[PDB]
Amino acid sequence: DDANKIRREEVLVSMCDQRARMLQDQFSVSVNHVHALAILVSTFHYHKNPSAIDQETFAEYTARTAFERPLLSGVAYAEKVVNFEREMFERQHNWVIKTMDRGEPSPVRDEYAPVIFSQDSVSYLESLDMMSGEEDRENILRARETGKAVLTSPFRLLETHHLGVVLTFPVYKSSLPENPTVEERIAATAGYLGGAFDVESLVENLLGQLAGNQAIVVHVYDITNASDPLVMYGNQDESLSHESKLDFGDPFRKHKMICRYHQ
Amino acid sequence: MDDANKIRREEVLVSMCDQRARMLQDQFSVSVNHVHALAILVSTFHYHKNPSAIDQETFAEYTARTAFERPLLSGVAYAEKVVNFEREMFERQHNWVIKTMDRGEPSPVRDEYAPVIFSQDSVSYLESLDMMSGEEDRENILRARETGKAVLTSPFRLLETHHLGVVLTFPVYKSSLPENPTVEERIAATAGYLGGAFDVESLVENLLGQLAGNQAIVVHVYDITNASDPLVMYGNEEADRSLSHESKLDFGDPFRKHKMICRYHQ
Ligand SMILES: C/C(=C\CNc1ncnc2[nH]cnc12)CO
Ligand SMILES: C/C(=C\CNc1ncnc2[nH]cnc12)CO
């Protein structure tokens, strides 16, 4: 103690706040660029007739703009397909809609969200029905009903098994009315532009290399349910902490960063 | 009056100025990055795709719908490189003639031109104008293509609005650009130029005027690329001569340097 204790607190606050700012900013930049991609698919795939976007073009553009989406492992576009359209859709694409868990031909469902365009980094998503995973399905529904960006809870991503969160933006047909109801949004839905925030790897890359990292313990929690906080980043451990604010841009979810010293 | 109160007065000026500088720098950075994406969009969807997916109508729609991604820009446009040998061909295909910026008159013979072929509707008056026919624009085009990176002009009064602003340009290259290109190779491989108008006078005023304490403070931004010839980029004025603060700005072009100066009104 004691003047040194005060300085120690001031360092913790500064360190934590800066990390939180860095993470919030990189998230925001990624979300904004994903929004632009949703707009691109709408403009080029739906407003233009015939469509003037395809897998080759989507892959090239997304590869070349990967720098615009720093915390994302990849982006993809899933198209809305209702069951009566499935035969026609599968014949057009020359593949069958598959389940996420086993890659098996999808059983009949009322509707599906198969990935038709993908960044090569997530090429394994192609033809998978994004509604066949619960976190993804919930995201898709809330995206299309709200008309805005949505985030999942943290969960382990396909292929890598890295802990992350999925971001989804809805893409609508031009038949969407102005000031639409939710019912109108659903009817006008074309598909879903998604991005995978690979927190486990890419947030570790962001924060783990920073000076002072060995002196502090950093966690990011999804606190959407205050009684059931979910680890998004950091270890599973349950005196002096500091809470730094995070806002990842989906009002349905809440997050915070907590930092502590080791000793 | 108080000496103690004066220290706090300076502390507040520093904080207010530094915050405004950060905001300006960050918003410009966001705009530069989204202009970079547009240059990639033109390369991928107009040049690489056979046939092109971008006509004027498509460019206008996409850029209108994404205007929010580019906060300090009044408009974006794409100018294609046209060498004189090709001019008659280009004009016949487009069904219009390349015009000068100063009078919208048919361009005289020049070695090359940079006519705008795609434009956000906000800068629709740029269509068919040779961007090499304005000196600030011409210098920007050359440095963009030679360096391969984003470039900014000195402050000048923009077309139509006459607002004081700066122009941002990214080069677009042909697929023939070699890896690790020389400058000579970059010039030979140039397709055109994706430009954006930073309307500093209107849009920086809009940004600053909404902030709490705006009436208490005077904010000026200077282009200090030439130390002995500072150029006003933003600002007018009745200001407190006894105290000022300088805040750092980095707008992303190593060829240019800038700073912000804030003072109290009184
Ligand atoms: C294409 C869409 C979402 C992307 N979701 C995923 N993207 C990448 N990896 C994953 N693993 C589990 N889900 C994902 C549409 O919302
Ligand atoms: C299209 C290009 C630049 C855009 N330049 C301008 N864009 C809009 N207003 C202006 N006034 C003078 N120059 C401009 C290419 O570098």
UniProtKB/Swiss-Prot annotation, chain A:
Induction: Rapidly induced by dehydration. Down-regulated by Pi starvation and induced by cytokinins.
Binding site for N(6)-dimethylallyladenine: 136, 158
Binding site for dihydrozeatin: 136, 158, 168
Post-translational modifications reported in the UniProt record: Autophosphorylated predominantly on His residues. Activation probably requires a transfer of a phosphate group between a His in the transmitter domain and an Asp of the receiver domain.
Extracellular topological segments: 1-263
Tissue-wise expression: Mostly expressed in roots, specifically in the vascular cylinder and pericycle, and, to a lower extent, in leaves and flowers. Present in seedlings.
Inactivation phenotype: Reduced sensitivity to cytokinin (mostly in shoots). Narrow vascular cylinder composed mainly of protoxylem cell files, with no apparent metaxylem or phloem. Hypersensitivity to ABA. Strong drought and salinity tolerance only in the presence of CK. Reduced cytokinin repression of several Pi starvation-responsive genes and increased sucrose sensitivity. More rapid germination, reduced requirement for light, and decreased far-red light sensitivity. Reduced sensitivity to N-isobutyl decanamide. Impaired benzyladenine (6-BA)-mediated repression of the iron uptake pathway.
Binding site for kinetin: 136, 158
Phenotype for residue 130 to A: No effect on activity
Residue runs in coiled coils: none
Impact upon substituting residue 124 to E: Loss of activity
Phenotype for residue 158 to A: Loss of activity
Purpose of the protein: Cytokinins (CK) receptor related to bacterial two-component regulators. Also binds the synthetic urea-type cytokinin thidiazuron, a potent defoliant and herbicide. Functions as a histidine kinase and transmits the stress signal to a downstream MAPK cascade. This protein undergoes an ATP-dependent autophosphorylation at a conserved histidine residue in the kinase core, and a phosphoryl group is then transferred to a conserved aspartate residue in the receiver domain.
Protein's recorded name: Histidine kinase 4
Annotated source species: Arabidopsis thaliana
Gene, per the UniProt record: AHK4
Residues of the full protein shown: 150 to 416 of 1080
